[PDB]
Design a protein around this ligand. Structure first.
Ligand code: DHY
Ligand code: DHY
Ligand code: DHY
Ligand code: DHY
Ligand code: MN
Ligand code: MN
Ligand code: MN
Ligand code: MN
Lengths: 320, 320, 320, 320
C-alpha cells in the first residue's frame, strides 16, 4: 500500500477536465464539435478548448495536437486556493514528482500543481479558472444529442486494491465495488461529488485511461447520438451499448474518437451525498453487474485503453 | 344541406399541403425554417416550398408573399390521375366554381383542380407531384424539435352540421365529435387516412382557417419547441399548450407565425383504419373534451383564425 | 410461382391477431400479463384472450394450451362480410384446403375462413368481431412499458420470391426489400395498412413464424421492458436489441416467451399510405440494413422460429 | 436581521423529510400511494411513512391524522451525531424554543432536535435513521409516473431579506434570486446539497408551507401524472403547469392533495456544487423568471399555502 501522508489530503470538489493529445486536430475537431456538439470556448492552430452545455468553468476538455495519442492530464478542482498548496505538500510527502505553475498549464486555468501519482497517472489540482457563459438555457443551441456535463474518468491499473486505498486516503468514498468471496476488490467506483463517481478503477495493464464520460438529460439523447453516427456512416465507432449498467444504474453508450480514445455518454445515476451512503457490493460472478440486460461485453472494452503521459510529455510504460 | 351529387366522390387519400400568403417573406422564412426547422425543397424571391422530415412529395407548405395574410388553398392528394377528373365533375355538379390547370397551381404539382367549395373554402385535388429525397433517416439533420409529417387542417365554419354532411358525402368518416343532448354536432374530426383526422370543423365565423398541424415523434420534441421559443424571447407567440387533448388523445401545442396564422404541433393519436372504427362522442359540457388536464382555453383560440381566398386571390367575406 | 386466380383477392384491412399454442398456460400468462402488461379480454382454463391498449376488437392474441408449442393462425381482418366469401373463393381457386365456420374459430370472432396457404401457413380472414372497451385513455392502467397495438407478423419461408409474388397478387404492397445486384429478393416488408408492414418474409427453413410485433408510444417504453426483465432476472430472455432497424427505421427489441416464441416490441416507423409510396431497396451487403448502428445479429435470430399448424392441428413439416 | 450566533452552525447535508398533518388518513393514503405511487415504508392506524424510489433513509414523508391540516416539521439531515448537538446550541443562542428527543420524534429517526425557528417554522435536525431497502433498481415496481427522490421545500414568509440573511448564516448558499433595481431580494433559492435548492423563500403571509417537491427521472414521467389524474377525474387538483421554470430551469408540475397541501413534481435542474457557483439574479419585471414559456401564473399559487405548527402542535398565527 501507498503510505498515508501526515499532511491532510487536499479538499477535492469534483473531476473538472481532461487534456488529451490527438494526432490530427482537424479530424478530432470534426468528431468532438461537428458530431458530438461540444461547445468551443476558444481555440488556436494547436489546441481546442471544449465545454459541455451546463459548464461555467473554462473547459471540460482540451484537445492538443501531438505525435502520440495519449492523455496528458486528469484534472480535479479543489475547494479553495489553499488546497492547491495542500495538494503539492501531500504528493511531495509521498515522494512523487510534482510541478507547480502559478500561471497554469492550460489556458483559462490559474495556479495549479500537476503530479505523477503513485499509480503513474498525471493528476492536476487547481482552483482558479476563468468563468464563461453558462449555456444552460440556450435552447436555441440545444442539439438532439446534447452533452450537458462532464461526469467522470475511468482508469486502468494492475493493482486495484492498492489504488483503492490510495484514493480513499485522498478522501474519495466508494459508492459501489465488485469483490469476490475472498473480499478482494476487482473494480471500484469512487466519488467526491454527489453522484456515483468522479473516477473509477478497472483492473488491467496500466497506467491507462479507459474513458472519460459526459452526461445527457434523457435517454433519447443517447439514442440520437447512435442514430446520427449511423447516418454519418461511422457506426463502426460505436463500441458498446446502448445499455443499462448494473453498477451505477446509468443508461450508457461507449464510442471511440478518431485516435481510438474512448468516450462514454451516460445518464441517470443516483444521489450519494449522505455521510453513510450504503456501498453496493457486486459479486464477480453476477452476470448483471456490468450490463443489467445481460448483453455481451465486447473484448476490446477490456483490452484497449489510452496511454497516459509523464510530466515531460512522454508516455508512461504500461505494466502488463 | 348541400345536395349529394349523382357522380361519385373523388377518392381522397390524405391532406397534403397548404398554400399560405404571408406579408413579409423573410420574416416568415425565419420562423418556419430557422425556428421550426422545416426543410426547404426550393425557393425564389416570392415563394418558399417547405416539407417535413418524412415527406417524399414536393412540399407540405407553400409560403407566398402577398398584401393580405390569408390561406390560398387546402390541398388533398387523390388516388390516381382519374380522380382529378372525378373531383372536377363532382364540384361542377354542385354548381361550384372550378379551375383546372394541367400544369398545376404550385411548383412540383401536376394536373390539379381548385374549387371554391360549398362552405367557401379554396380546396385543391391533385395526384401528380415531383418526388424528392425522403429525409427519414437523415439523423445528421434531425433537430431536437423535429416536425416529421403534415397531419391535418382545421376549418372554422358557421354551420357545422351542414359542413359535416357535406364532407361525409365526400367520403370522410367521423372518428370523434362533440354533440349536445339534442344530437346536434358542435364540432367534428374527419378522416380519409388512418389517423384521427385530415380535417376538422369548428363552429364560428367563417370561412376561416383555424390551423394546420404537424406531428413530432415524441412528446419531448414538442417541449423543446417551447424551450427554444423562450430562449429566443418569442414565447408570446405560444398561444395554447402544451397539453393533452381529450378529443383525439394527442399531446399538443399551438403557436402563432408572424402574420398570426396558427400552427399546431401534435403527437400520438391512434389508429382509425378499420371499417367500423367506433365514433367517440363527447358531450358539450364535458370539461375534459378539449384539454384532458382541465387547463383553461385561451379566448383568442376561439375567436382568431385566418382569412381564406377565393379563386381570384381575394378574401372570402366572413359570415358572422 | 403460385398462379394468379381469376377471382378478385379479398380486400384486406390489416393483421388483427395471432393464435398461439403454449405448453403451460400459467407460465405463459405470467409472461404476457404480469411481465408485458397485455390486457385480458377474457379467459378460461384452457385459453386466454389478450389485447393491446388501443385495440377495440376482441383480441390481438389468443393463448391456447396444447402439447406442442406452435402458431395455429395468422388472422387478418377484411373490409366487409362479403370479403370473407371472396377469401374462400380465392383460395379454393388456388387449390388450397379451406375451412369456413359461420360461428368463428376463436371466441369473439364471427364468420371466418381459415386456409393452409400456398406457403404452408394457416391464414384466417374475418370481418365480424365483438367490440370491447377501447383503453386508449385509461391512463390509470397505463404501465411504464405499455404495448399499444399489434403491428405485424414476420414469416420464415424457403423461397422468398415465390412468397412475395403471391402476397402482391393478394394486394399487399412492398414498402422495403433487400435485393442482390442480380435483382433477387432476399426479404420483403409488405403492407395493406398505412405503416411499413402487416407481414414480412425472411428466407430460411419454413414455414415457420419468426415473430409477432407490438408497438409502444415512445422509445423509453421499450427500454423499461428491458429494465423490468433485468429486475425479474429474466434478462436471458432478451434475444436481440434494443436497437434501430435500417429497414423500417423502427426502434426495436426482440424477446422470447416461455416456449421460445419470439415477440418484437417496436416503435416509430413511417407513413406508406400514398399510392406511389417509394419502395426502398437495400443491398444484401449493406451492413446497416438490419441494425442501423452496425450491431452484430444473433445467430439464433436467423435459425430459431416457431412451428405452424395445419388445419387439423398438426405441425407443418419444415422444409430445410 | 436575526443576530449571527457565536457558535458554529450545524453542518447540514440536505432536506430529508416533511411531517404533514392530514384530516382523513384514508383519503390521503389514496392520493399519495394509489395515485402518486410513493412507497410505504410502514404504517399504522394514525400514521403513514412514505419514501421515494431511490431513498435509503426511513422516509421522506410522514402523514399523520389530525384535526387541522398543517405541516408539523421540515426535517434536515446533518453530517454526524455531533451536529445534532451543534444545532441545539445554535438555536438556544438565538433564543429559540428547542426540544430534543434522544429517541426521535417520528419512527425510524434517532436523536433529534426540533426548533421553532426565527421565522416561525418548525425545523428538525437529525443524523441517525434506520436504513431500508433502496428501490433504485426495482424496475418491477417502477410506475409510469415514478417519483424518485425528495428535492426541496418552499416556504412563505413576510420578510424575505431577513429570512435569507438568516439561512446564509446557517450555511445555505443562494444559487438564484429575484431582485429589483434597488437590490432588494423578493425571493431566493438556497442550497446545501449540489442541486439548485434544499429550500426556497417566497414573499407572502406566513409562516406557511408553500410546497414540498419530488423529482422524476424524465419529462414524460411528469406528463403521465397529469394524464392519470385526468383519467381519474381529478384534473381539478392540477393547479399549475406543466411548464418550464425560468429560475432553476426545471420542468415542473404543481398539484394539490386532499387537504389542499401543494406538491411539486420536478425534473432536471443543474449542478451547483462548486465553491464559486455563480448566483443567477433575475429582475422582478422579467416575465420569463417564473415560467420560461410566458404562461400566466394562477392567483391561488401566490395566495394559498399550508399552516405550520409550533412545538406544542398548535398552528402558528399567520402574519398578513
Ligand atoms: O458496465 C460496466 O462495465 C460497469 C460500469 C458502470 C458505470 C460506468 O460509468 C462504467 O464506465 C462501467
Ligand atoms: O383541444 C381541443 O380544442 C380539441 C382538439 C382535438 C384535436 C385537435 O387537433 C385540435 O386541433 C383540437
Ligand atoms: O433488423 C432487421 O433484422 C430487419 C427488420 C426490420 C423491421 C422489422 O420489423 C423486423 O422484424 C426486422
Ligand atoms: O416558476 C416559479 O414560480 C419559480 C420557481 C422555480 C423553481 C421552483 O422549485 C419553484 O418551486 C418555483
Ligand atoms: Mn464510466
Ligand atoms: Mn388540430
Ligand atoms: Mn418485425
Ligand atoms: Mn419548487
Amino acid at each position: 500500500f501507498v503510505p498515508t501522508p501526515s499532511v491532510p489530503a487536499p479538499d477535492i470538489v469534483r473531476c473538472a477536465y481532461m487534456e488529451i493529445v490527438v494526432t490530427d486536430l482537424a479530424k478530432s475537431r470534426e468528431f468532438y464539435v461537428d458530431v458530438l456538439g461540444l461547445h468551443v470556448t476558444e481555440e488556436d492552430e494547436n489546441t481546442i478548448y471544449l465545454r459541455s452545455l451546463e459548464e461555467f468553468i473554462h473547459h471540460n476538455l482540451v484537445l492538443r495536437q501531438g505525435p502520440i495519442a495519449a492523455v496528458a492530464a486528469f484534472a480535479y478542482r479543489v475547494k479553495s486556493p489553499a488546497e492547491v498548496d495542500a495538494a503539492e505538500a501531500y504528493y511531495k510527502e509521498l515522494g512523487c514528482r510534482t510541478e507547480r505553475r502559478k500561471e497554469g498549464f492550460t489556458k483559462g486555468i490559474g495556479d495549479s500543481v500537476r503530479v505523477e501519482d503513485p499509480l503513474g497517472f498525471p493528476y492536476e489540482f487547481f482552483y482558479e479558472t476563468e468563468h464563461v457563459e453558462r449555456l444552460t438555457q440556450r435552447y436555441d443551441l440545444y442539439s438532439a444529442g446534447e452533452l450537458v456535463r462532464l461526469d467522470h474518468f475511468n482508469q486502468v491499473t494492475p493493482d486495484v486494491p492498492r489504488g483503492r486505498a490510495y484514493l480513499e486516503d485522498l478522501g474519495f468514498r466508494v459508492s459501489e465495488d465488485i469483490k469476490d468471496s475472498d473480499g478482494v476488490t476487482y473494480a471500484a467506483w469512487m466519488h467526491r461529488k454527489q453522484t456515483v463517481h468522479d473516477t473509477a478503477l478497472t483492473g488491467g495493464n496500466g497506467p491507462r485511461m479507459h474513458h472519460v464520460a459526459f452526461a445527457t438529460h434523457e435517454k433519447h439523447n443517447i439514442i440520437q447520438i447512435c442514430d446520427k453516427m449511423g447516418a454519418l456512416r461511422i457506426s463502426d465507432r460505436i463500441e458498446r451499448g446502448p445499455g443499462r449498467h448494473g453498477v451505477s444504474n446509468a443508461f450508457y453508450l461507449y464510442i471511440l474518437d478518431p485516435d481510438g480514445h474512448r468516450i462514454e455518454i451516460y445518464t441517470q445515476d443516483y444521489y450519494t451525498g449522505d455521510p453513510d451512503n450504503p456501498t453496493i457490493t457486486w459479486d464477480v460472478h453476477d452476470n448483471q453487474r456490468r450490463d443489467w440486460w445481460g448483453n455481451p461485453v465486447v473484448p476490446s472494452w477490456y483490452t484497449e485503453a489510452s496511454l497516459v503521459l509523464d510530466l515531460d510529455g512522454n508516455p508512461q510504460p504500461v505494466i502488463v
